[PDB]
Each structure stands twice: as structure tokens, then as C-alpha cells.
């Protein structure tokens, strides 16, 4: 009831009571753990007020009037709108709280000794999809801000009956587009080839490209979702070279800088935005390893060991672990030559432990997935490999959600 | 009910029913996953449960569910509890068991093997001497000149948990480790705790990086007796790489033979506290953990400045860089003496064709992702993508005290 996390690099024994107040499941069972599952598979009105209580709660705690004046008055004022209109409001500075919070919860994340420093953008009076785009390309810019990145959410009006939903269609801001050839192969990302099938039947003048960037689909308030193209001056790109092999130029390729995920809902005191695309900067390994590398993405190993003559007729040869590696230092290399934010693997894995100890010493604890924590390369010579991790589900949430084509009454 | 686990790679979605026959804890609840969390005598009472299910299961699997021979085992076991609170297996229970807990054991990449065990029958053994004969022939016959084979020996069961058989080395072959007056460590640092004891209990060490320790053996709940494994039937292999030439001037060596002695196989609720298994090394247990972890032979920065990388600031990745010539080099080194291994991609490989086999032939494989994930180039082999379900099955490999904690000595 009072869990202890070991490290077994450093014998620190951390003790969790956050874990507590954990609500929503895990997915686990007493016989069977799912911690490997990527997914396991609107409120009424006495459902939305506890959601209300527990979230002011913990927001008037953190700002030392628990059981205070102000404190029973907003209680007691979203309770009255509640009973009146079925939802309620935020004040701003519940808003920046929740979504503040929402990242520091987020299990998943290796990069949240960041949490505090999050840009909140209150789009909530956005009312058509090309406000969004508006909302969106100011995102895009403040975040980027010329390579020196910075965090930034920007949050769109929340769910009200449910057939006003506003969606970003893309799974992230920026993508490069999938393309199916005559041949059988497929062009771009494999990834969004469907995602790109939606743009051109929506109308997307595609121009077949390797790295496409993709046209942004915005719903505004349930309406059939629009097409814009965001600013090519505002999508920052990098070249990838290496800083050895001068051939590595030949291989075309580039990524963008700033990833920004805009297909969850983030729960705040029981409302939910469906549309709230956030941002950071990369971890090298997210690009390196999964993007270029994943045999279902752009799966470049073979091409690349065959550049630097290795022995690839045998695995024990390990010419994919070798390729690996340069790959991810090219990566790196290039965002660092152009001035782009990234951090390596063993950057962000220390700052995550710290961060860890720190939510311990002064939160009790910090849910952590560690299937996800743990990079896709030279995972135990990073510090969270040695990392107990104990995963539960805190509110405010990042949470998953339908894909909207699946969903929308065209 | 049904369970489904997706292959994010392939689009493969397969079909669990087996977890309907799991049993113990897992450690998770609805509320928390301790998916990560490395850890967690009987009576006649809860025991013929625990008999009936396991008879149960091993006459179905001979296709003899309800026979009468498999009756009269259900009467005759029954009795023996009654009587003498216990009960004993037939040979064919018992290598029956320990194959079945090898194939339940959630956390091993290599159980496409688990039909191929040799079972050594132990039960008869009295003494530590009898004991240091037993494992001896053990590590000869799996060892094998080095085309290693997968084997068990079987010590007596728990009778009252007052006289124990345990194997105090928590595996048959490893080195010593000596902390310095200075904090330093020489060999593994692992084995400093355990290495104290065979010095305290009279082993002469020699006090080198490389020291083979000695067998510390405990017969019937008496006090543990020290034996030096016959150095001749120790194989190891000197590390070497295929283009560095220094490499071999690191003065680096392993031993061939990976045999875990210190877990409790239960099998029909008896409960085994010494059986040694073995089989062959998957070259990351080495390469990467072995030499590479900070706890460990930490070699990354001696390799590394011997490449010559640029060591400043870790974005250059010289530590990744040097985690791949190492582990080049223990494949290398094996594969040259002839020396059994198998390096992380196909090993990874094989085991989700058994994966899949399993679900198809026995409705699920049981799987603890974080442990069959290797410590190397995760997401390139094709366990990181595969969806998988943990949940205990009996026959089972357990964790168990290290003995040290819990014996009253003798002395
Ligand atoms: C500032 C630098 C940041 C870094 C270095 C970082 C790092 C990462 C990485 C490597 C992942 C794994 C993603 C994957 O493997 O697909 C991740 C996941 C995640 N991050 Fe962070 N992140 C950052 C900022 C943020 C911000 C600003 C938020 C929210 C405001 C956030 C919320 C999340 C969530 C919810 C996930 C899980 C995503 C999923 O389930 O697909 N991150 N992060
Ligand atoms: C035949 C070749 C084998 C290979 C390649 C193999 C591979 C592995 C590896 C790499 C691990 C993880 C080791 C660690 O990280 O500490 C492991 C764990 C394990 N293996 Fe296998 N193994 C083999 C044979 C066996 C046999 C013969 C048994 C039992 C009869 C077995 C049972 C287990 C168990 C119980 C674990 C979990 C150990 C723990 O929890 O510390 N394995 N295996
Ligand atoms: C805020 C943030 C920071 C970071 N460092 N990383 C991410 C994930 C980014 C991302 C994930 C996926 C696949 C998710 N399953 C595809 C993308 F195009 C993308 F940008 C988000
Ligand atoms: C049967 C078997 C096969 C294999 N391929 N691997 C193992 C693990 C072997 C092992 C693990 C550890 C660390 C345990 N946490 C230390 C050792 F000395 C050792 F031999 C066992
Ligand atoms: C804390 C974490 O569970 C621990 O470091 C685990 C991770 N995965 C592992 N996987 C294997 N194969 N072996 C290990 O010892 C570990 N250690
Ligand atoms: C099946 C498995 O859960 C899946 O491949 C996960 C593993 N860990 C991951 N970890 C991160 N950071 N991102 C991912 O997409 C995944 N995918
Ligand atoms: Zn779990």
C-alpha cells in the first residue's frame, strides 16, 4: 500500500504513495499484466461533478487554500453551473494548471522534468477550422522559435453533446506523406499512407514526393473537416548528413524539427478537448531508430550497411547494430550543426531519473512506463533500463482516442 | 474469454485463451502495473489441489485424461499425502515438470528449446560431496567440448523447509569479486557479497579478475561445504575482435557455460529449492550486461578510448559505438572456438515463431516483455514490437531467499 521502486544500478530505494490517488485502470489484472499492451481497448451530469471536486481539490491545495474561502466559493460556483448548463468552464488559470499537470502524468514521457515550463494557448474561442489553422500556424511558430524550441500546447473548445467535436484529423502537425506505387513498394511513410489517402479524397493536391509535408485537416464544432497547408517557412526542416561519412549526403534524407502530437484528448476536472496539439523537441532516437529504421516506416538499415561495406550476410555480424548506431550520430549531428533542439538518449534518460527523484521527494512518486521510458537502442546502458517503475493512471490526462474518419458522420 | 496481442509490425493479432489456466499473482492490480518490478512449507491441505491439477495436466498431455491409470495415480498420490503429508514423482512426472516450467517461464527468450532437456534425477543424492559429484556431471555433459546442451539436475524436494538442499551460488560458474581498501572492486563486482562467504568459509582466492568460484553446497539443511569445480571442466573463451587487435590486449575472457542455481522449481506443488539448469549464452548477457553495465566489468570507457571516439559529451553516442564492437567481439570469440551462442537478432526471431507456434498449438506463450526485450538495439529485432500477455502457469520457475539470509548454522 506504501510501494517501494529500486534502482539496481544504484540500490536508491524510492517509496511511491502517489499511486493512491490513481483512478482510471491499468489494463493489469492480479492474473495477467498487460504493461506491453500499446492500447487496451459524454458525462452525465452526476459523473462530471466529482470529476469537478477532485480536480479543484488538488488545484487549490497546490496553491495553499485547501478549505479555503475562495476555495468552497468555486466549489460551490461550478457545482450551481453544473446543475444549470451540464458542463462548466475552467478559469484560465485552472486551464494552465490541468494541462500543465495532464504532461506531468503522462507515463509515457521520458521528457517531463520539463512539465513546468509548458506555453498554454487558450484557443477555446475558436469557432471555425480556419481560426484552428490560425491557432495552429502561431503554434507552430512560437514553438519552433528559428531551432530554439520551446513546449507549447494550444486548446481548442472542449467536448459539449459530443456531435461538436473539434479534431485535428493528423496525428502530428507535421508528417511527411505515404504514397502506394504501381510497383507494389511504398513511397514517403508507410506510416500515413492511409492519412494521405483522406487528403487526397478530401481534395489534397498531392505532389508524390518522398517528404511530403502533409496539409493539415481541421473539424471545427462536429463540421466536415477542411484542408490548409501550413506555411512552408514555418516547418523548419533538417538535412541529414553525418560527421564521417560524406556519402551519407546521397541518401536524401531530412527530417522536420518539431514533433507535435495533436490527436489526443486531454482530460481536465471530467472535460474533455478533444483537440489539443502539443509540442516539444526530439529525442534523437525517436528519429534515428524508429523513423528511418522500423522495417514499417522508412527502413533504411539495408541501404545504408550496404554504404559502408559491411558484412551482411550473417546477423552474428551485427552490421544492423553497427548501421544503427551511425545513423542515430548523423541524426543528432545534423540537428546540432543547423542549431535545432534534440537530445540524445543519454541526456534525456539522466534528466528523467532526476526528475523521477525529485517527483518522489516532493510529489511521492511519478507513474512511469517503463516499456515505453526505455529507449529503442543501448537500452541498459542508460539509466532508466536499471529503473523500477511503477505505472498508474493520474488525472488531468493525456488520453488516447478514435481516429475522427472512423467516427464522422461525413 | 478471449485475449488478443497485436504485432504492431505486422498486423499480427493472435488469440490468448491460455491465461484461463493461470494462477498465481502477477503483482499488478487494476489500479497499478509492477510490470517492472524485478521480485515479488505447505500441508496436506492445500497440496492435492495442487497434485490433482498437475496429474491432470500431465495425463492430458499423454492423452490418457481419465484413464485408469491415470485414476489410480490420483488414488495412490492421494493416500501418500494423507499419510505421509507429502508425495513422490514418477520419473516421467518429473521431467514432464521441469520441461513444462522451462516452457512457462515468462521471462526466457530461448524457450523455443524447452522439448530438448536433459533431466538429470538427483533425488537420490544425501550429501554436499554427492552433490559436487552430481553438478560436475553436469557441466561436462552440457558443456560438451562446447556444443553446449540444455540440462537439469534435480535435488531432493522440500520435506519440513528444516533440510533444505540449496546451491548457495546463485550460478554454477562465475567469478570472483574483491572490493579494495580503496573502493575499487577487481573481477565482477556482482559476486563481492558471495565471494566473503567462500572466503570466510575457507576458500583460498587468488585474487585475480577472473577466478572461477568454488562450489558452495548445502546437503539436507546442513551447513554448506565448499568444492572446487575441476578447472578442466570450466570452458571459457577469450575475447578477441575480428579488426581490433588490441582487443585482446583488454585481457578479457568468459565462460561458456550460463547454469542458474538458485531458483526453486515447484512442480505439483513440491517444491525443488536446488536445481541447476543450463543452457547456452545469448551474446548480449555478455557483450552488453556482463561488461557493459556500470555495476559490472564496466569496460565502455576503456574500449572507447582505445577506438579513440570522442568521449566529451555523450551525444556522440561513443558509448553505443563501443557497446557494438564489444558485443561483435563475444560473437566472434565463441564462434571461433566453436563455443555455442546465439546472438540477439536470432534469438529474437526464433522465439516469435515459438511465440506463435504456442498460441496456435497450446492457445497462448506467456511473456514478459521488459525481460525478452534485449538490452541492445531494442526496436531492430521483432520481440519490441510484439504485444505480450505475463501471467503465471504451473510448473514454474521460482524465486526463493538467498540461503545465507535464511539458514540456522550448524556449526
Ligand atoms: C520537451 C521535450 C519532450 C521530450 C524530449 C519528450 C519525449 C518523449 C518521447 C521520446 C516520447 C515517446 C514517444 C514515442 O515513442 O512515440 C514521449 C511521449 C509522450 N509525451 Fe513527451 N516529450 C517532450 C514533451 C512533451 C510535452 C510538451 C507533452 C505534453 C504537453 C508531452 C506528452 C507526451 C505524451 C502524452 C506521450 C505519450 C504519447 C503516446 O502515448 O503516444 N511530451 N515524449
Ligand atoms: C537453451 C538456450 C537458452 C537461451 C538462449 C536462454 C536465454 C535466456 C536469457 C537471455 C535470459 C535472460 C537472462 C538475464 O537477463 O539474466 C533467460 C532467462 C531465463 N531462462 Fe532461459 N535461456 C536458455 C535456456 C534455458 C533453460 C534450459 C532454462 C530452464 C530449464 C531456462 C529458463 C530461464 C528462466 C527461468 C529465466 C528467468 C531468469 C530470472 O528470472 O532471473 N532457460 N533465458
Ligand atoms: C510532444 C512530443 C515530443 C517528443 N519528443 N515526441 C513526441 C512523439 C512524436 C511523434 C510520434 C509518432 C508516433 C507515435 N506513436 C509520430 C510522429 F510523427 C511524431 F512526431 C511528442
Ligand atoms: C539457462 C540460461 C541460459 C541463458 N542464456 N542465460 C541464463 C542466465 C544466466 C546468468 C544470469 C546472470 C544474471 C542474473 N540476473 C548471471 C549469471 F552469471 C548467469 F550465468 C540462463
Ligand atoms: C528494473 C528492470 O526491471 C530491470 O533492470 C530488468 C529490466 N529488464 C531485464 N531484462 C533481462 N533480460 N534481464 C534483466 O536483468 C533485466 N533487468
Ligand atoms: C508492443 C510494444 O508495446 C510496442 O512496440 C511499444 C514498445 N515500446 C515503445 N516505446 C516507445 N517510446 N514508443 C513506442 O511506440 C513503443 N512501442
Ligand atoms: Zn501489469
Known amino acids: 500500500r506504501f510501494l517501494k521502486v529500486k534502482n539496481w544500478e544504484t540500490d536508491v530505494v524510492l517509496t511511491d504513495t502517489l499511486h493512491l490517488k490513481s483512478?482510471?485502470?491499468?489494463?493489469?489484472?492480479?492474473?495477467?499484466?498487460?504493461?506491453?499492451?500499446?492500447?487496451?481497448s459524454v458525462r452525465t451530469k452526476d459523473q462530471?461533478?466529482?470529476?469537478?471536486?477532485?480536480?479543484?481539490?488538488?488545484?487549490?491545495?497546490?496553491?495553499?487554500?485547501?478549505?479555503?474561502?475562495?476555495?468552497?466559493?468555486?466549489?460551490?460556483?461550478?457545482?450551481?453551473?453544473?446543475?444549470?448548463?451540464?458542463?462548466?468552464?475552467?478559469?484560465?488559470?485552472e486551464l494552465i494548471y490541468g494541462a500543465k499537470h495532464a504532461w506531468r502524468n503522462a507515463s509515457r514521457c521520458v521528457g517531463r522534468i520539463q512539465w513546468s515550463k509548458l506555453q498554454v494557448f487558450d484557443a477555446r474561442d475558436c469557432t471555425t477550422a480556419h481560426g484552428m489553422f490560425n491557432y495552429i500556424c502561431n503554434?507552430?511558430?512560437?514553438?519552433?522559435?528559428?531551432?530554439?524550441?520551446?513546449?507549447?500546447?494550444?486548446?481548442?473548445?472542449?467536448?459539449?453533446?459530443?456531435?461538436?467535436?473539434?479534431?485535428?484529423?493528423?496525428?502530428?502537425?507535421?508528417?511527411?506523406?505515404?504514397?502506394?506505387?504501381?510497383?507494389?513498394?511504398?513511397?514517403?511513410?508507410?506510416?500515413?499512407?492511409?492519412f494521405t489517402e483522406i487528403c487526397i479524397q478530401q481534395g489534397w493536391k498531392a505532389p508524390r514526393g518522398?517528404?511530403?509535408?502533409?496539409p493539415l485537416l481541421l473539424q471545427a464544432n462536429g463540421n466536415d473537416p477542411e484542408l490548409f497547408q501550413i506555411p512552408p517557412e514555418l516547418v523548419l526542416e533538417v538535412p541529414i548528413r553525418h560527421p564521417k561519412f560524406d556519402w551519407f549526403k546521397d541518401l536524401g534524407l531530412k527530417w522536420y524539427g518539431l514533433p507535435a502530437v495533436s490527436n489526443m484528448l486531454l482530460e481536465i476536472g471530467g472535460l474533455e478537448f478533444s483537440a489539443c496539439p502539443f509540442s516539444g523537441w526530439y529525442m534523437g532516437t525517436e528519429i534515428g531508430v524508429r523513423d528511418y529504421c522500423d522495417n514499417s516506416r522508412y527502413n533504411i538499415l539495408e541501404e545504408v550497411a550496404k554504404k559502408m561495406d559491411l558484412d551482411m550476410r550473417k546477423t552474428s555480424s551485427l552490421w544492423k547494430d553497427?548501421?544503427?548506431?551511425?545513423?542515430?550520430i548523423a541524426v543528432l549531428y545534423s540537428f546540432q550543426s543547423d542549431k535545432v533542439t534534440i537530445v540524445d538518449h543519454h541526456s534525456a534518460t539522466e534528466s528523467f531519473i532526476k526528475h523521477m527523484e525529485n517527483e518522489y521527494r516532493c510529489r511521492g512518486g511519478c507513474?512511469?512506463?517503463?516499456?515505453?521510458?526505455?529507449?529503442?537502442?543501448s537500452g541498459s546502458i542508460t539509466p532508466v533500463f536499471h529503473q523500477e517503475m511503477l505505472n498508474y493512471?493520474?488525472?488531468?490526462?493525456?488520453?488516447?482516442?478514435?481516429?475522427?474518419?472512423?467516427?464522422?458522420?461525413?
Not at 494550444?154 to 502537425?173: A, C, E, M, Y
Not at 518522398?210 to 502533409?214: C, E, S, T
Not at 507513474?367 to 537502442?377: E, F, G, K, Q, S
Open 322 to 328: 553497427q548501421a544503427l548506431v551511425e545513423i542515430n
Open 210 to 214: 518522398r517528404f511530403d509535408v502533409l
Open 48 to 93: 462530471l461533478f466529482p470529476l469537478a471536486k477532485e480536480f479543484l481539490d488538488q488545484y487549490y491545495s497546490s496553491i495553499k487554500r485547501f478549505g479555503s474561502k475562495a476555495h468552497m466559493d468555486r466549489l460551490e460556483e461550478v457545482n450551481k453551473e453544473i446543475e444549470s448548463t451540464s458542463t462548466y468552464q475552467l478559469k484560465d488559470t
Open 367 to 377: 507513474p512511469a512506463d517503463w516499456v515505453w521510458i526505455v529507449p529503442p537502442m
Open 393 to 410: 493512471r493520474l488525472t488531468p490526462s493525456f488520453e488516447y482516442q478514435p481516429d475522427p474518419w472512423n467516427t464522422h458522420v461525413w
Open 23 to 40: 483512478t482510471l485502470e491499468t489494463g493489469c489484472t492480479e492474473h495477467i499484466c498487460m504493461g506491453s499492451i500499446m492500447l487496451p
Open 139 to 194: 503554434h507552430v511558430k512560437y514553438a519552433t522559435n528559428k531551432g530554439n524550441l520551446r513546449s507549447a500546447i494550444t486548446i481548442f473548445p472542449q467536448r459539449t453533446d459530443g456531435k461538436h467535436d473539434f479534431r485535428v484529423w493528423n496525428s502530428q502537425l507535421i508528417r511527411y506523406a505515404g504514397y502506394k506505387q504501381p510497383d507494389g513498394s511504398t513511397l514517403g511513410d508507410p506510416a500515413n499512407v492511409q
